[PDB]
Amino acid sequence: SPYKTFEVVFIVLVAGSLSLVTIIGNILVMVSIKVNRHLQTVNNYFLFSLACADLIIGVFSMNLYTLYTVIGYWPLGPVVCDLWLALDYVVSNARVMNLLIISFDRYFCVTKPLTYPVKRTTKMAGMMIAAAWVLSFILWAPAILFWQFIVGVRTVEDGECYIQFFSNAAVTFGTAIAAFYLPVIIMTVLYWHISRASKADLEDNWETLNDNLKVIEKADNAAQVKDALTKMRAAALDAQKATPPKLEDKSPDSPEMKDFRHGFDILVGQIDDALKLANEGKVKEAQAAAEQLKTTRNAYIQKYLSREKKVTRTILAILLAFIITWAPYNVMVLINTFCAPCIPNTVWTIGYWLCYINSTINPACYALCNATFKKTFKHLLMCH
Numbered sequence: 001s002p003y004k005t006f007e008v009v010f011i012v013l014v015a016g017s018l019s020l021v022t023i024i025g026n027i028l029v030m031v032s033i034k035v036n037r038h039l040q041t042v043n044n045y046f047l048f049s050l051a052c053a054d055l056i057i058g059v060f061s062m063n064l065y066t067l068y069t070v071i072g073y074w075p076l077g078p079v080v081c082d083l084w085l086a087l088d089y090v091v092s093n094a095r096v097m098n099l100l101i102i103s104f105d106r107y108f109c110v111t112k113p114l115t116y117p118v119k120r121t122t123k124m125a126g127m128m129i130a131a132a133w134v135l136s137f138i139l140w141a142p143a144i145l146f147w148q149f150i151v152g153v154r155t156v157e158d159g160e161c162y163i164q165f166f167s168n169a170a171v172t173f174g175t176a177i178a179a180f181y182l183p184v185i186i187m188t189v190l191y192w193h194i195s196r197a198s199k200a201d202l203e204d205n206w207e208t209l210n211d212n213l214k215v216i217e218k219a220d221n222a223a224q225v226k227d228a229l230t231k232m233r234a235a236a237l238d239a240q241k242a243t244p245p246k247l248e249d250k251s252p253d254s255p256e257m258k259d260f261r262h263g264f265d266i267l268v269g270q271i272d273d274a275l276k277l278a279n280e281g282k283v284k285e286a287q288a289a290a291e292q293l294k295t296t297r298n299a300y301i302q303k304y305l306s307r308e309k310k311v312t313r314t315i316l317a318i319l320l321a322f323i324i325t326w327a328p329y330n331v332m333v334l335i336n337t338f339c340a341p342c343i344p345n346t347v348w349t350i351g352y353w354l355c356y357i358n359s360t361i362n363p364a365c366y367a368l369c370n371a372t373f374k375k376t377f378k379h380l381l382m383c384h
């Protein structure tokens with residue numbers, strides 16, 4: 001049997017690789033926040049706790065589950081089985097309520113801007129996270145570890161490992177409704193109000209100008225400099241015709257409004273001088289003209305202040321990675337209520353692993369898309 005042996009070797013290598021990636025990715029996130037004060041924001045306190053739960057899944061949950069399935073039975077005894085099940089459900093429950101914290105915290109920043117942001121400190125973020133881990137422990141740990149003593153008998157036979165009060169299929173489904181389906185519904189409606197609040201005009205023109213200015217700096221060919229120069233110049237004219245939040249509410253004839261438009265008139269003059277050199281053949285000099293643009297922009301940035309579009313996109317990615325990876329297991333629980341043979345044990349293992357995969361791809365939802373995390377990752381990996 002040369003094939004059944006290769007499947008075991010393939011599974012061990014794939015499981016060990018996923019566990020290793022989950023460990024490294026989440027440690028890099030947690031260490032980056034600790035060593036860089038620029039990453040010590042309220043949002044990253046919630047991501048630190050999220051990466052903290054993902055690290056426990058990669059270290060304990062993934063490895064103990066791989067040993068369980070490869071050997072074919074539970075070899076570590078009943079005590080370690082209860083501790084593993086309790087740790088798995090508490091850490092998972094803390095993740096779900098962590099996503100609820102991120103969703104509600106973002107909801108009150110767009111619906112209560114005159115009240116909530118001033119109440120949004122790292123001490124409040126630490127208390128909400130601490131309360132989430134305490135509530136998760138109280139909900140799952142005593143029931144998983146001590147239900148056998150309440151009923152007075154341990155029905156989990158030797159070599160088996162499962163939650164004892166889940167012997168009733170309807171009980172498992174009620175758990176799926178309260179611990180997964182209801183939270184996902186809440187996070188979906190919360191995001192629906194987030195994207196509708198994002199869907200005012202001054203932030204859209206200034207963000208387009210700054211984003212296309214970076215594209216010129218890191219452009220590989222001549223098509224990326226032409227598209228960025230035109231789309232930025234279009235956004236610069238729409239940002240010039242509008243009035244910024246100026247002090248004292250000054251008329252268009254004021255020296256503040258005249259010099260504000262004059263700052264954009266200098267920028268368009270340098271943009272067309274960069275567009276010229278890009279067509280003369282000095283595409284490298286047009287990229288050197290972007291530094292002159294960044295100087296003029298910085299010389300007249302005192303009239304303006306938004307990365308909130310990226311923040312909303314980041315939350316959606318974190319929520320979708322949670323829904324997509326945890327949905328297959330929960331529909332198996334639903335089908336299990338009326339047809340247990342409809343879900344083979346191989347399908348159960350796959351659905352259980354997909355939930356673990358949520359911890360693997362979670363850092364890639366935000367860390368590999370944020371400019372500050374990338375710079376800190378490079379610094380953590382270079383040899384001093």
Ligand SMILES: C[N+]1(C)[C@@H]2C[C@@H](OC(=O)[C@H](CO)c3ccccc3)C[C@H]1[C@@H]1O[C@@H]12
Nearest residue numbers: 088089092093175176179180330352355
């Ligand atoms: C570690 N898991 C893979 C186990 C199986 C799944 O369980 C669930 O999806 C249920 C809701 O049906 C759930 C339990 C606790 C917290 C959140 C969800 C995902 C997580 C959770 O700890 C268990």
Ligand SMILES: [Hg+2]
Nearest residue numbers: 052053055056
């Ligand atoms: Hg941790």
Ligand SMILES: [Hg+2]
Nearest residue numbers: 049052053056
């Ligand atoms: Hg933790």
Ligand SMILES: [Hg+2]
Nearest residue numbers: 321361364365
């Ligand atoms: Hg992702």
